[PDB]
Amino acid sequence: FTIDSARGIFPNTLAADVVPATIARFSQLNAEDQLALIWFAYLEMGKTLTIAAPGAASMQLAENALKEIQAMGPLQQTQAMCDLANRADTPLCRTYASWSPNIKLGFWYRLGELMEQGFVAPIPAGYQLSANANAVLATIQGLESGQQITVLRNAVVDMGFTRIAEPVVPPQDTASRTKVSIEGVTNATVLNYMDNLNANDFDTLIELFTSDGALQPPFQRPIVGKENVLRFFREECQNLKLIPERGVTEPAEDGFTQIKVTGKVQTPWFGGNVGMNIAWRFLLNPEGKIFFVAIDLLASPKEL
Amino acid sequence: FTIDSARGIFPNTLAADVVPATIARFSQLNAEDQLALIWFAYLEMGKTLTIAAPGAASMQLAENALKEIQAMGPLQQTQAMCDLANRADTPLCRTYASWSPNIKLGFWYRLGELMEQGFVAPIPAGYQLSANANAVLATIQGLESGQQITVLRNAVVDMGFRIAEPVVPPQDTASRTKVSIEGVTNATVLNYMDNLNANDFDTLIELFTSDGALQPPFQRPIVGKENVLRFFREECQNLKLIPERGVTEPAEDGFTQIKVTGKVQTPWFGGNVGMNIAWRFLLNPEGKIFFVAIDLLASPKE
Ligand SMILES: CC1=C(/C=C/C(C)=C/C=C/C(C)=C/C=C/C=C(C)/C=C/C=C(C)/C=C/C2=C(C)C(=O)CCC2(C)C)C(C)(C)CCC1
Ligand SMILES: CC1=C(/C=C/C(C)=C/C=C/C(C)=C/C=C/C=C(C)/C=C/C=C(C)/C=C/C2=C(C)C(=O)CCC2(C)C)C(C)(C)CCC1
């Protein structure tokens, strides 16, 4: 068993690879078209889905950068946004790249509010997308909400020129914690994984892993080793709600066990308004430690 | 005008972005599935489309790596190929990454022949692709040949974790052909096409502004004469550009923008694959190339 070979467990699992396909098409676009397309997608999505407000701490971390942009003239504001989209090498792009995804998202949330108000240069009036851009937006608007928000998030995270993160919130009080139930699955490691993540208890969660174990987020390469996985939990995985439904348990090579669970996950950005269809694919060693876990965004509810 | 803003000229040009979409899907796959998928695509494509043999110089440059793999036991051979697909950090992967695209392609051409012959571990008998991988292969097989070969090339180039073929002397001046483009007599555009068709990179590069850029299909702009010239020498030998028609318009600051459409042949396939291409030029007032983008078009309808 290697981490990279483990990526192949449960090969029947149909991931929503339209997401990275769409991000790839988006990434080809002219920067102004990238910005306008997201503006359009954002505006129309906002008619039925409300984005949660960025946290106070996140806003403080992005404040300096936001103030600099607000102080610029309109042409310069537009240029700064194009710089981010083009991944140009500028001080602002370097600052942006140092930020965790949540801080990047909160930065754009605020710019969006300011553009709506006319305090930061808006997308030009009557702007029409390029041929390729119009098709990309059409694709996005045809996707399930869980896929739409993943496309938008990944586009945002990709910006800037490549560590600052929000403070780590204390774990949930033990007596207040809920426990998940999974049809077919009573495996203690899997249950403890879900329960500890739901309680933001990253120190306990990381102890479930082998020293060389990995976690693979949707459409990303495996994050390998306890140090890197713990960093990822602390920077990116706060305040999720995992709602696993059902699973299946099978023996693997060398006394290992492989378990696939399907269910839903909510991000604090949208709460119960977007339930993403997710699979977890675990490979556990003979002692029950996590050697590998992959988290996949599923192609449709037909994959649960 | 910035290089990055110039990327937006002629915005109704519909590029074949199914190519980078498909590469992105492919890149998500398990490595063994990546290898099997390409094996399948390769085998089926080869029933109607023959790949030209790698050049002698290229083969010599890849020879040591190929010999090392051939000396391995079958399990190790399979692992070595998986390492390349996974972009693992290994000596072989580092050597591979140092190679120009043509050398990487020739390396896999040879491994393909050896797998067919049974001298390098083949894809396991009766191998079945994953759900996601089967769909990716279906997409590829539905594409026009020019798009298929671009997907395969880009997948190959992406593998692994400063070595190029020797530069071939430019074509004898008296032997050179000249292109004709309906609607377009612009000397810079004509000289661009004619010099590239003659492998005359030293003359070609002089058409560019010092800070000018060239943007290959689905890649970021390559900026400045040093980098553009390097790209010509490493990657752009022995092409055949067959421009057909164009359109010429004024641009800002006394600049001119010109779009040309036509076909291009790669020496890997010759006339057997004609790729539908657009060139989008932005020329300064003196006629120098500030920006040229080369796009693979979505269909002949473009
Ligand atoms: C840019 C831009 C603009 C603003 C755009 C904005 C404002 C976009 C905001 C988008 C947001 C807020 C998207 C949030 C999406 C969040 C998602 C998709 C979270 C998914 C998390 C999951 C699936 C986690 C699953 C996990 C599990 C279950 C595990 O078991 C282990 C950990 C982990 C893997 C993490 C404007 C409009 C100005 C126009 C100009 C350009
Ligand atoms: C991996 C692998 C295998 C072998 C795969 C092989 C063997 C694949 C070979 C593929 C090849 C040989 C593809 C070649 C494609 C070449 C292309 C698509 C060239 C396009 C060039 C263009 C469009 C240039 C246009 C330009 C123009 C016109 C300009 O004006 C400026 C310059 C430039 C921009 C360059 C096997 C089976 C073992 C299985 C295991 C894994």
From Swiss-Prot, chain B:
GO terms for biological process: light absorption. Residues 16-161 form the OCP N-terminal domain. Keywords: Antenna complex, Chromophore, Membrane, Photoreceptor protein, Phycobilisome, Receptor, Sensory transduction, Thylakoid. Echinenone binds at residues 32-42, 78-81, 105-115, 123-127, 149-159, 192, 236-241, 264-275, 279. Disruption phenotype: Loss of NPQ induced by strong white or blue-green light, cells are more sensitive to high light. It comes from the Bacteria. The keyword Transcription does not apply. Induction: Transcribed from its own promoter, it may also be cotranscribed with downstream frp. Its cofactor is 3'-hydroxyechinenone. Monomer. Interacts with the APC core of the phycobilisome (PB), probably at a ratio of 1:1 in a light-independent manner; possibly only OCP-R binds to PBs. Interacts with FRP. Detachment from PBs is accelerated by FPR. Acts as a blue-light photoreceptor and photo-protectant. Essential for inhibiting damaged induced by excess blue-green light via a process known as non-photochemical quenching (NPQ). In the dark or dim light the stable inactive form (OCP-O) is orange, upon illumination with blue-green light it converts to a metastable active red form (OCP-R), inducing energy dissipation, quenching cellular fluorescence via NPQ. One OCP-R molecule is sufficient to quench 1 phycobilisome. More OCP-R accumulates under high-light and low temperature; in the dark OCP-R spontaneously reverts to OCP-O. This is Orange carotenoid-binding protein.
